[model samples]
Structures are given as structure tokens and as C-alpha cells.
Target chain A: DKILDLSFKKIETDLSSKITYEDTGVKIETDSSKSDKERYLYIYQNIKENWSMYNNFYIEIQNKNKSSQKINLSIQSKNMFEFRLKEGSEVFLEGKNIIYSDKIKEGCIEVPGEFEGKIYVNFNSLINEESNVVLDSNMLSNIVSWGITFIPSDEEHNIVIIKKISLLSE
Target chain B: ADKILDLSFKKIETDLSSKITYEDTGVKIETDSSKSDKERYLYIYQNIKENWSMYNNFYIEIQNKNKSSQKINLSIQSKNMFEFRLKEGSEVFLEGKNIIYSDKIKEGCIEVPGEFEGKIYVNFNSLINEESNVVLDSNMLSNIVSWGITFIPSDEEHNIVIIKKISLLSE
Candidate 1:
């Protein structure tokens, strides 16, 4: 086996300070030391989106007479619920386990002040039938805050909230 | 039987001990801490080994079904078996943490079931299609369709080693 000479050095960070979140919103900003770091958050978001879409929402599309109703919207991007999805699926509010913290690994604002933002999620399920009660907004029926907290980080942190939401179709 | 692995796929390296240890591949990277580590200090890397090339599609299936046990343990590397696809700066993990590409393992060995064990380490850096299959006889006869696969880049000169002594307690 070839031996690697590069020894890993531990960089100390007091990831000790805390940031608090009050209202369900905040003004958010970011600064990244690495470009891939930016993608990591988006990737993480997408993974969570895909998982919740697969597990949380049960979508249903209704075709009454000649008109068709969209039940779920495609989750195209993990960063946002714009990814491609099958048509006719109704997407209601999708709950998420988003952490609320001012500490960011990528987007770090230099202002060192309070920020605000809301974690909004939407999705569309694959339309199986008019009565197709797919796991949609109703799936978010179990919406509850796991642990919502506002954390102020002295350094970059991933402020997130573990909360849930639901989106329903008429 | 063999394939290649990319940088994104998690990989690791360790010294070759004569005992058994465990590691996880793909999606979530985890390790079995229940077993005592002569040295738990492992490494994960993304750099390609000098001659090692991890092949894709190859696998290390547990021989006996752990119907009663709560956890399973194993090591993941692209050294002995698969030798097709692998690139530099790929994700490799030793033990349970990430390490650099050029690291080396001195002594250790992972015990695998005699049935589902092979020395084929393949790399899976460029696999968008599903290719291999996994099956067992004790529990079921039909082959299990895989949703995804784990591949490691190769190091002709380097292979990871995991050491674990049989234990009765969980860690």
C-alpha cells in the first residue's frame, strides 16, 4: 500500500457561540471559501426534498369532465421545488426538517447583524388517478416542529429549523 | 464483474490487518464502532492510488443473513477486485472518516462471508445505468434488484485493511 504523507491538521473553530431565531423569518446572506461548498447546501436541500417528496406528500390528480387539475408540481431543483415531475399531480405544503441557525458554511454575510428568511417547500406528486390520494399535502398532517431555534453563530453556521408544512389541493 | 468509481462516491483506505472490520458505501457513510479497533484512525480519500483502479458493479455481499443481529460490518475499497474506472480526487473513506488519496494501510483484514465474498474491487466513476445483481439462498432465492451501487477507484499498490476482534458487547 502506498503511504500518504499529507498529515491532516485540525483547524480550531469555537463553533461554540449560538444564534437565535425569533419570528418564522430572517434576512439571510452567505460567503463561501470554496465553490463546491455552495453546491453542498443545494445538494443537501435537494436530497431532503427528494426524500420528503417520496415520503411526505401523497399527490392526487383529479380530472373532472374535460378539465384536469394539477395536484403536485414537479420538484425540479432541491434548492427550490421546481424540478421536473409527472403532470396532474397536486403538490401541497411539504414539511421539512430545516435547521435554523445563523452559522453558515457557504453563504456568510459580513454585516454580522440579524437576518431573516422563511423555509418554504412545495411539491407535486405523480398523478395516478382522479381519486388518486397520493401522499400530498395531507401527508404533512403530521406537521410539527421537532426543534425550532434561532442560533447566532460567531462563525459560519448552518442555521436550520426542523419544522413541517403542508400544501393541499381543492 | 468489475467497474469504475468516481470522486463523488465515498471511498476509504486502511492498513491490512488480519481481522475483520466494517464500513459503508454510498448515500450515507457509516462505520461499525461496536467492534474494537486496534486503531480506529482510518482515512477517506479522493486522490487516485498510484496503480489501484476501482471497478464498478462488483460487490461484497454478506454471506449469512443477519436476521437477528442489529448491525452489520464490512470494509469498502477498490483494490483487490474491481479494476476498471477510477479518477484522481475521488471520495474514499477509511474507518468512517474521509482521508486523502495517497494514504496507506499497514496491516489488517476484513472477514466476509465465504459465499458472498470476492477479491474484485471495481471503480464506479461513470455509471448512470444499473448493471449488477445481489442474491441470497438462506432468506430468499430471487436476486435483489439494486437501486444504486458503490464503486471505488483502484490503487494497484494499495488496498485498505480493517481489523476487528469478535465481541459480545455493542459500542
Candidate 2:
């Protein structure tokens, strides 16, 4: 129960197109160009930190490879906490806002993403008694295809995505 | 028309400035030179943590009383059981670590993210509503653990939400 070595096993693209991750509340994701980002896509709740009422849990963005371009990330809550991540990606993991310090029992990962050079994260740095951690990776295809862009008007056209979340303590 | 014109001219000359000062509507917990920000923050954190409210939303207001103080830094050593809720425009900041538990996967007050490990720091803000009907049922923790939220409740009955463990750092 204490040790949680969680990682993405596989991301299938052929089922309809590139699979996108989405959630009803706190999760977010997108699908292939053919699919609507809002419908028929959701990342499985690999980990649920708290869930008695409603929660805005962590979400992942899907991609084909490193050079392949990804989609935009967005979030909306009742109060505030706006977030959107990208490849050549980055994440920030700040702990509780001092109000509920009594409830959370584990560390946290601030941010996470992967690409090349500065994009790499030191996984070992994510160790703390009650801190936050963020993990990221890029496939070989993404690295090779990043230099090329599919559309002329698009920004840096590389397709690398990332997922960042917080794991509560047991 | 002549009378109206005269009154308008009189009012315009008398009141050319249009700026309004403001004051807080609720109990104003201000930090003076004598009370440190840390002590004032502790007062606010403890107040919200001990409420008997349900699991919909929670909000805390923080302000800088020091003219030169643009920010406040302090580590909070405590735990919470109620599920955290966030509105469309609210924000929550976590420095070292925070543990959250709930039952509903999508709707409530506090927004719980996925599991993570490393240096904890999240910057987010929004709104807080007290009238929302989101109640933190202790039984919800059962499913949170089954789906994999990282923590579980030790007690199953009337507890707000069990605090199995907590280890956070803020400097």
C-alpha cells in the first residue's frame, strides 16, 4: 500500500485514431482529429486521491510520438486553479493551501513533462515525506518528428504530451 | 430645462472625482505589526478545518497587511478530512504537500488531482461557496481507495474522512 509505482502501460492509436484522455470532473484529454475532445474519451482513474463528493482529479494528454504535435490543455473549477500543459512540457506541484494541512499525509510532484534537453525530469527528485512529484517521457518517434510541422500556420509542430497528478498518502 | 441644467452643472462641479474605497463584508482577520503572518494564517486554517460543514466547497481568504509584504510564506502542519472543493474562479496553493479524500469522482468543492511524487508546489485559485449541498460522506473513502487515490479511511462510520497519514514540508 505504501509503494505506488504507477506508469502508463500503453496508448493505443488505431482503435479510432489517437486515443485521448478525459474525465467528467477534474480530468482532461483529447482524441484524434476525427474525434471530439469532449466525448468518448477518458483516462482510467489509475489513482483516486479523494472522492466523497466531487473532485477535479489529474488528467493526461495523448500523443503519437515525440515530433508529433499534441493538443491544448485546459481546466475549469468552481473556484479557481487554471492549468494547461504542453510537451517540451512542464508541471508545477504545490501542496495544500495551509487550510487542510491536517488531511493530506503524503508529498506531491509539482510539475511534469518530457522532450529533449531541458525537457527531462529527474524522477528521483520526486521523493518527499509530504511533497509533490511529476513524471514525464517522450517516445523515440516524437523526438524524430518534432522538427517538422504538419500545418504551415501551426506553432512548433511536435507531438509530445504529458500527464501530471498528485498521489495522497495511505 | 433651465432648472435641470443648473442642477447638473452644480453637481458636476461639486463632484468631479469618481473613486470608491472598499471594506470587507465578513469578519476581517487582519495582521498588525504585532501579529506575525504565520500566526494569522494559523488562525484562518484552524477555523476552516474545525467546521462541521459537509463536502461541497471550502474557501480561505489571505491578504498582506504589510505594505512591503507582497507575499506570505509559512509551512502548515496539519491534516484534513473533508473533500476540498473549487469553483470556476477559485485558486488553491500548495507548497510542500497536501492529502485529500472524497467519494464523488466529479462534483463537489475541493478539486483532487491524480497521484504524484516529488517536490510539491501547485498554484491555483478560484471561488468558495458555503451554501452548496456537497457533503463529505465517510463512506465515500471506501471507493476512493478502491479506485486508487493513495489513501484510505481507518474508520468507516461518522468520521468526516479518515486521516490515515500526512507528511508535507514548506519553507
Candidate 3:
């Protein structure tokens, strides 16, 4: 079940809140005037009580440019696991202080150039039991919201759009 | 009195790039003048996740065991860091950072913010268990990342420092 539909229209962000929301999805635009630090930092929504119920998470990003972008996501529970998404390539994940530089083979699907694809990230199987990401529905459900900070890995130029975020439950 | 992080005596040397050695009761570090000041820091904790708002006062215990005199810089809260180092053979537990408005942050021994809003720097021996002054307000303390201590050696000074203990108290 899709618990929450992500809408950037009213998202809490330090960027240009006024983004291009089309019938297809939310277009995440960039600004040259702003520093990369928060050139639209934390482009996410403050969710309500339904945060922890959903575990299977993924975002469908549309990269219509020549290059791919990196998006760091925080599934804010009292427990925090930060994961970065790149092409059909890799996910940089962290639990507590032990950063798993090892790439996650599963979860992220293949999206060819100028095409769109799903980046699925499930915490339990993101790796073995080593991940400190708390999936306990009861404990996680206490948190307030989820957040995402998307930025290009480098100064490479390209236009990418956040089609939508899927918060699925088992 | 509460002990938060005991980085002094870990009995391990995990990363060479950190330029620090862990002991049973304290930690040691190396510094050189060749590298830029920014490159001199040896961190005990890379990323700290503690809530400073919970405590009213905090302290750091450092004992310099170097034969040669040296000065060092302490870092916290990311950008606005703690600076200055002390003499050799003297072991002192002092404040590492200056507190803003809350009484939770206390710093002394090296000299960064000398006196701010009537909160002066303080220094004492480890033999004496001293309580921190109401130095930094919770306002400034709240912004601290609780980022742990990072030691940076002044130019050309090579010394071994033992970062002993970090303690806290509440009013």
C-alpha cells in the first residue's frame, strides 16, 4: 500500500519552494545563484503519524539530462540511515558511525540514460543485519517526518526530476 | 558527575590518517608544521550524535606529555572551532569550547574565547573534580553538534597528547 504521496508543492525546503509540478511528476530544478550547500537543500515533506508503517521505500527519478545526479535520503525515525542514490550504479549507506562504503547490489534498479527508473531501498535487506537502521514499526512510528536532500555528486550539469516517492508497506 | 565519552584509553589504533594513538587511560596524537593547519586535526569521533541540550555543563580533560612545548586547536560545532594549545608535562581538565547563552558549555586551558558575556575560561588539575561555570547558554549549546574533540597541532610542533576524559554536570 502507498502510505504517502510526495508533493513538492508544499514541501519544507530552503530552496526555491516554487518548483515545476507537472502532470507527470515534480520537476526538481537547480539554481546557479545558490551554493551547492543548500541550493535547494532538504527538498522533502514533513509527514505525520504514518511514517514508520511503511518500510519498502523507493523514489522514481527522471533524469532527462546527459549526466546522472545523486540524491541523499533520510528516512527519519528516531533511528537514522542515510543512503545516496546514483544511476543504476550504487547506494552509499550509513548506520550509526559505521559507514558501509560497500555498494548495495539490490534495491536500486537500472535506469538507462535520459530514461526513468525506480531506486528501491529496503533497510532490512539493504545489507545483512549489520545495518543500524531501525525498522521496528513501533519505535520508528514515533518520529515526526521523512526528509531528502538531492544534489549532483559533482559540478556536472544535467536536469533531473523527482517523479514521485513511494512509501510501501509489507 | 557523568562520563560521556572516554576516548583517552581505547587500546586501539584504527586509522593511521588520524595521527592519534589510543591508550588504556588516554589518547596520543602527532602534529607537524609541514602540513596546513586544516590538515593537522586528529579526531576522536568523526561524527557525534549527542544532544547537548540535556546537560548544563561540560568539561574536557587533556594532559600534555610532550618533552617539547606545543599548542593545539580544538574543534566543535563544525565551523566556528576552538583554538589554542598549552605547555608540556602539565595535565589539565579544562573547557574546550566557549558557550554562547546556555550554561552547558565550558572551555579553558588553551584560550579561544577569553571572556564572553561574563563567562571566563577556566583550568584545573584532573586530581580535583571541578564543576563547570554557567558559561555558554543553552541557546549556543543547542547549536553544538556535540562533535567530539579534534586536535590540531600548531606549526612545527611535534608532541604526544593524552585526551583523557569528557565529563558533564547538570544544575
Candidate 4:
């Protein structure tokens, strides 16, 4: 497999949060007093010198929270465009056709309670035209950061482990 | 000014992969061997409910994935058809022929070239009449049932591309 790894060597966090580089992995946590919307964390690293040489991009995450939580995974280019990955639960289709089979209401991914495995935040797997943030040479060189955000939601408690972030050319 | 046709190429409904592959990333089209060697082009068409004559102009975006460079031919088939290369103010040729005169159609790029990589924008008036410059009649627009896009490769072999987005934007 031809993959370019963007390891979390450095991080930036909000005033109410901190990132712990643990033996297991990188743990990003928020202060109990802060609301989910106020919680923030980002991983900054050089993805590649050029993005046009690659075909796809993705982020891998592990839910460390004791209960399921909804979170947004995003990637941004320098003042150009900010695209969020599609993640949500399924909606029942009135018919049994392929068109409505994989449809899901647009939102954040809902990690199961105390999940003990890895789930992919695929950026390009959706059928929506706006699903993938098509990268170009300018965007690749202008990329500023890649990370996850916890917006205001019912599941106040939020915790997740950054497993691996990489890009594939094949 | 509603969008008439929105094609993401996310699913391969038929066996169009010999010509293109509908992938999660984008529609990947390759120019190479096929069962029909005489056919040098691949395309996809979709029907539209709105009248084509109602819109004054349209916007479209395409990305080139070839390592070197590639040229794409765009065609709009209504009661009539027109083809053009991907260049602002480029000549608009009549269907199936390289020669024919159309009034200077108003078209140009919206941004600087390097701002968006290989992405290109095309805007032109209705395909029905290039001389009149008048909005098409409702009857003509009603008759416009389907529109299609075709991919042309420079090389007979080993050329590839991924169409990121294609939308028929209205004025």
C-alpha cells in the first residue's frame, strides 16, 4: 500500500483543553466545565509537498469516550475551502432500491458506547457531489491544519484518540 | 435560476466502467482499449425537467488528473448541438464539424489560473442559437429533454482523468 502518513508531532488546543501524548496514542480531552462547542483540538503537520500526485484522503479515529458521541472531522486549506466529512445515522427508505439504500441524514459520526475499535472517517465515500474536498497543488501547499471538532450536542462528554491520518495514492 | 442537472458520478448504474469508473473519490475515466475501437469518446447523459431556453447562461467546473496535461471536449445536445475546447472565449463549433461561425459568445474564467489547480469554468448562452443571442422559446426549451458530457483524451493509451464536479448552474 502506498500511503503518506501525517503523524501528530505537534498540536494546538483551546484554553480549556490539552493533548496528552500517551504510550498508547494521542489523547485529546476537554475540561469538564467547558461545553462541547467550546472544546477544540487540531493536529498540524506537512501532508505532502504536492497533493495533485495523490487521489484520496482520509482520517482514522478511535472513540475513547465511555459513551457514544457525535463529532465532526474536517480539513482546511489556507483561506480557500473548509470541508467536513459526512457522518450520521441511517434513515429508513420508503422503497428497497439502491438509490435510498445508503442514504443518511447529514451530520457527525455517532460512535457507539465504549467502542473498542477503529472507525474510518472516510471523506470521499459519500454519494454527494460536495462530499470530497478535491485537492489541488495550491490547496496542498496551502493546507493549514487537520483535526476534529465537537459541536454543541446532547452527548456532552467527548473523548477520542487520534489513531492515524494519511493519504492514499493508489 | 435553479440547477437543472447535478451529476456527481457516484454510482455505476450500467456497465459504463469500460469507459469510466464511478468511485467514492470521483469518476475516473481512462482512454484506452475498448470493445469498440472505432469509438474514441465516452459520455453520460441525463434528462432535465426545466426548459433549457429559460436560462441565459450556465457554469461548469472540471479537473484534469493526467500527469502531463489533457484537453476535454464539451457538447450540449438539445434540438441542436455544439462543441468547444476548454478555453475562455474559445471558438464554438457546430456539431460534428470544426468549421462554422457563431456570434462571439460571452465566456471567461472567474479566477486566476493558479488559484484552483486544474479546475476550469465555462459560461455561455443557450445552445440553440448563437446568432440571435435571444432567450430560447419555451417550446424549444420544453423539447430539451437530455444533456450529456463527453471526455476526449489526447493519447490513444495510458491517459486518465477524474471529473470532480459537474453542475448546470443557471444565471
Candidate number with greatest TM-score:
4
For candidate 4, the per-residue lDDT at B133 reads 23
* Decreasing TM-score order of the candidates: 4, 3, 2, 1
Candidate 1 residue-wise lDDT, B1-171, digit = tens: 222333232344443221222334322222333233344422433434322121222222222222121112222222222222222233322221122122121122222221221122212231111111101000000111111101111111111111111111111
lDDT of 2 by residue, A1-170 (tens): 13222222233332222222223112222223333222222222244343333322332222212232222222211222222232233333222331111111123222112211111112222211221111111011011100000101111111111112221212
> Which segments of model 2 are wrong by more than 4 Å?
A1-15, A18-66, A71-170, B1-128, B131-171
Candidates sorted by lDDT, best first: 4, 3, 2, 1
lDDT of predicted model 4:
0.30
Give lDDT tens digits, candidate 4, residues B65-84: 33332233333433222122
Off by over 4 Å in 4: A2-15, A34-37, A44-60, A77-79, A87-106, A125-170, B1-171
lDDT of 4 by residue, A111-148 (tens): 44343343332223322224242222111221222111
Model 4 steric clash pairs: none
lDDT of 3 by residue, B65-163 (tens): 332322222223311221112222334323323433322222212322221112222221111101111112211111111111111111111212211
How big is the positional error of residue A35 in model 2, measured in Å on the Cα after superposition?
13
Candidate 3 segments exceeding 4 Å error: A9-18, A33-40, A51-53, A78-113, A125-133, A136-170, B1-171
Which model is ahead, 2 or 3, in terms of lDDT? 3
Q: Isolated chain A: TM-score per model?
A: 0.18, 0.19, 0.47, 0.46
TM-score of 2: 0.18
DockQ of each: 0.01, 0.03, 0.02, 0.01
Q: What TM-score does chain B of candidate 1 reach?
A: 0.17
- Candidate 3 per-residue lDDT, tens place, A10-122, comes to 33233332356565665545432323233323444433333223444444555444443334433332122233332243542332333333343333332333434444454
